[PDB]
Design a binder for this molecule. Structure first.
Ligand SMILES: *Cc1cccc(C(=O)O)c1
Lengths: 187, 241, 257, 99
């Protein structure tokens, strides 16, 4: 048991299907595991495959090809809560547990009605202090990182206003520079 | 049931000693200690096939374990080094080939001095009138700045009750000085509500940051207040205008 | 080549007398011991020099930790089995697991447990089920049959891992395991009985009979270990002209009298 | 509990030759439980110089092992095997015969 590969990152659309592949090489095998790990959370067990074949359990399926040294985890009808790292692991002849680096899965919300816009919010005690919000953009839209190191820019973030069946993308920026305008702050 | 790992967060000075607890009530024979570092994945430190025995993983150097009982598997840092900055997961499994159950992890930072530890400053930014008029929705933003280590829990509280709906927090606190290895951190979060809900002056919005820092038995001889574990919050009332 | 086998045996004893291990594990390729672990040494050690020479310290370090785990499991299984039966005092739990590689290329595999030296559980790796002698066994079989992942693990281990280990150990020990030592055979008279006696032979499978005039009521001495890796055995009787016949590794021998 | 009393067989490694350095074998088999004590005797005396194979187990769950010592048979000398086990009120002795 020596090597294990799975892709770093995958992005699929809410409602759709995603297949996370894992290749392994080893002389000796006591099974292949998939685990799910949510950000800031513990991994939990999804699947064990040791013979050739397919196992299903709700929306999740795990496949193993012994001769090809190949498993996949298949996730159907993707929900936003499926955003997580997926860890592929295998046991060698001595029951050593060999861990892949993990695949980060990003679920893209299906934004039917884009309304891309950059807003400026005032601090709630001092006027001076100001953050910029880039909200309501398409899920294909890419938030590039700062080129000024006195300007901070967050990753894209999905919020879900549940009681309204409404989801929106969001990115935040801020700076102490007075020459800072929320306009032309995300391009 | 499950695996109970403590503490969830921990800061240490270089050379300080630390024991992480891990207990399972599932009569599992196997218990494990892993560190998780960006890009590497899961690295076994030590494991124990049963009470009465323990054995090295791939990275045992700097660590110690005991398996006195089936239930407990402590991990000891004998002399904390910067390189032991990591997230530690304890785990149990019934057999060598049976699935692992994980503890909820320990976020551990080791710093040269505890004078590099600062609590967050927190501020709420009120929704843009332009957002409100264009979309009939109101996005509050919370900013936590100037904190070290990156050991925080950010929650939103609406008329004194925690909310999850309408909330998006950055997965990762961002470095204010990416160059510096002792760089303090910032974290953003948004709470979006309807414009009428923001406009109702009866509604109360609190951004809350639980920071993990020093304890009461940590020595502290600096001018500024002891950067102890504490909550720093910021708040806004709804405004008709 | 001929059929070969890897078997591992486990023995546990509850409240065992002083000196006597709580738990022993020994592995065999055919009749040859290869490995040993117990509760007193707490170490997996080779039992053949061609095992000790071809397997590094980390192999023994790792199986030490595994056999500590298995010792603990066995102790717990055995206390559970005893309370199910309301048995007090010292009682026995035994397991045999292994696989065979036949002349044809075909394989077998098997896993059974005994309680106080009686059949208790026998695994069927093809129907992925457990046979139980009684109802206490049935109860345990049901729990085990509820865990499909474990049943599939065992099947895989018997059909793939066990055979892989057998092939690796045969290579390491081929000079011993695949040698032939033909029998030295002689006839001694006694009381008026004739004794066909064979010794210095390996492997232990041998056939011995007696015949008047080439036409076929005989005492058989069992096949016993001689203590040097070879084996010995005899056949006896009390017409006119008699002859002893011996067959071993595909060679027939005849001694006339 | 069914218990099986040991079968005890005593013999030389090679055909016995007075004054030729042989090996004396006592094979104890088909017993249950595992707890067994075995001595080899020279003229009724316990031989200290006595190797044994470690314990072994059968398909039928009964146990077996081999006790042996380097020895040199003589006309006068007389060799035996003394086994105690829980199926035996008194240790069982089986003497060697040369033939
Ligand atoms: C050393 C070893 C390997 C596999 C199984 C066993 C056992 O059944 O005890 C021992």
């Amino acid at each position: 048991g020596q090597n294990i590969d799975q892709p770093t990152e995958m992005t699929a659309t809410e409602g759709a299907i995603v297949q996370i592949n894992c290749t392994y090489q080893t002389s000796g095998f006591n099974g292949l595991f998939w685990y799910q790990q949510h950000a800031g959370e513990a991994p939990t067990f999804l699947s064990y495959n040791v013979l050739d074949g397919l196992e299903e359990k709700g929306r999740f399926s795990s496949f193993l090809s012994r001769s090809k040294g190949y498993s996949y985890l298949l996730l159907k009808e993707l929900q936003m809560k499926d955003s997580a790292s997926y860890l592929c692991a295998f046991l060698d002849s001595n029951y050593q547990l060999i861990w892949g680096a993990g695949t980060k899965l990003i679920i893209k919300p299906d934004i039917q009605n884009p309304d891309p816009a950059v807003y400026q919010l005032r601090d709630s005690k001092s006027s001076d202090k100001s953050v910029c919000l880039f909200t309501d953009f398409d899920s294909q839209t890419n938030v590039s990182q700062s080129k000024d190191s006195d300007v901070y820019i967050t990753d894209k973030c999905v919020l879900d206003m549940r009681s309204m069946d409404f989801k929106s993308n969001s990115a935040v920026a801020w700076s102490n520079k007075s020459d800072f305008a929320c306009a032309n702050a995300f391009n | 049931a499950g695996v109970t790992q403590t503490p969830k967060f921990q800061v240490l000075k270089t050379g300080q000693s630390m024991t992480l607890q891990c207990a399972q009530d599932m009569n599992h024979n196997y218990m494990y200690w892993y560190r998780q570092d960006p890009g590497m994945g899961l690295r076994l430190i030590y494991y124990s096939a049963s009470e009465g025995t323990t054995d090295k993983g791939e990275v045992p150097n700097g660590y110690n374990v005991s398996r006195s009982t089936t239930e407990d598997f402590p991990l000891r840092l004998l002399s904390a080094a910067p390189s032991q900055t990591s997230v530690y997961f304890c785990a149990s499994s019934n057999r060598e080939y049976s699935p692992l159950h994980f503890g909820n992890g320990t976020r551990l930072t080791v710093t040269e001095d505890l004078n590099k530890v600062f609590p967050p400053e927190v501020a709420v930014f009120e929704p843009s009138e332009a957002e409100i008029s264009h979309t009939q929705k109101a996005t509050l933003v919370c900013l936590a700045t100037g904190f070290y280590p990156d050991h925080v829990e950010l929650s939103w509280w609406v008329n004194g009750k925690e909310v999850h709906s309408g909330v998006c927090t950055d997965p990762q606190p961002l470095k204010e000085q990416p160059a510096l290895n002792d760089s303090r951190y910032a974290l953003s979060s948004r709470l979006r509500v309807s414009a009428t809900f923001w406009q109702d002056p009866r509604n109360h919005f609190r951004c809350q940051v639980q920071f993990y820092g020093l304890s009461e038995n940590d020595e502290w001889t600096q001018d500024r207040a002891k950067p102890v574990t504490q909550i720093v919050s910021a708040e806004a009332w709804g405004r008709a205008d | 080549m001929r059929t070969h086998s890897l078997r591992y045996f486990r023995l546990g004893v509850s409240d065992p007398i002083h000196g006597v291990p709580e738990f022993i594990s020994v592995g065999y390729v055919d009749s040859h011991p290869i490995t040993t672990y117990d509760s007193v040494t707490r170490q997996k050690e080779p039992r053949a020099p061609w095992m000790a020479e071809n397997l590094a310290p980390d192999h023994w370090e790792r199986y030490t930790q595994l056999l500590r785990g298995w010792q603990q499991m066995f102790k717990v299984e055995l206390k559970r089995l005893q309370r199910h039966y309301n048995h007090s005092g010292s009682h026995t739990y035994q397991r045999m697991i292994g696989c065979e590689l036949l002349e044809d290329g075909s394989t077998t595999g098997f896993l059974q447990y005994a309680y106080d030296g009686q059949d208790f559980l026998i695994f069927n790796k093809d129907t992925l089920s457990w046979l139980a002698v009684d109802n206490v066994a049935h109860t345990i079989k049901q729990a085990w049959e509820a865990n499909q992942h474990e049943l599939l693990y065992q099947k895989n281990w018997l059909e793939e891992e066990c055979i892989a280990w057998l092939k690796r150990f045969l290579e390491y020990g081929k000079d011993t395991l695949q040698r032939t030592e033909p029998p030295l055979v002689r006839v001694n008279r006694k009381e008026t009985a004739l004794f066909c006696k064979a010794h210095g032979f390996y492997p232990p499978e041998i056939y011995m009979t007696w015949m008047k005039n080439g036409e076929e009521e005989i005492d058989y001495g069992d096949i016993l270990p001689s203590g040097d890796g070879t084996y010995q055995a005899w056949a006896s009787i009390e017409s006119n002209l008699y002859s002893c016949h011996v067959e071993h590794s595909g060679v027939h021998m005849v001694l006339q009298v | 509990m069914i218990q099986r009393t040991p079968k005890i067989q005593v013999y030389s490694r090679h055909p016995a030759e007075n004054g030729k350095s042989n090996f004396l074998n006592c094979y104890v088999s088909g017993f249950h439980p595992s707890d067994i004590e075995v001595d080899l005797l020279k003229n009724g005396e316990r031989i200290e110089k006595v190797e044994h194979s470690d314990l072994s187990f059968s398909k039928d769950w009964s146990f077996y092992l081999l006790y042996y010592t380097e020895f040199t048979p003589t006309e006068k000398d007389e060799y035996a095997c003394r086994v105690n086990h829980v199926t035996l009120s008194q240790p069982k002795i089986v003497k060697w015969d040369r033939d």
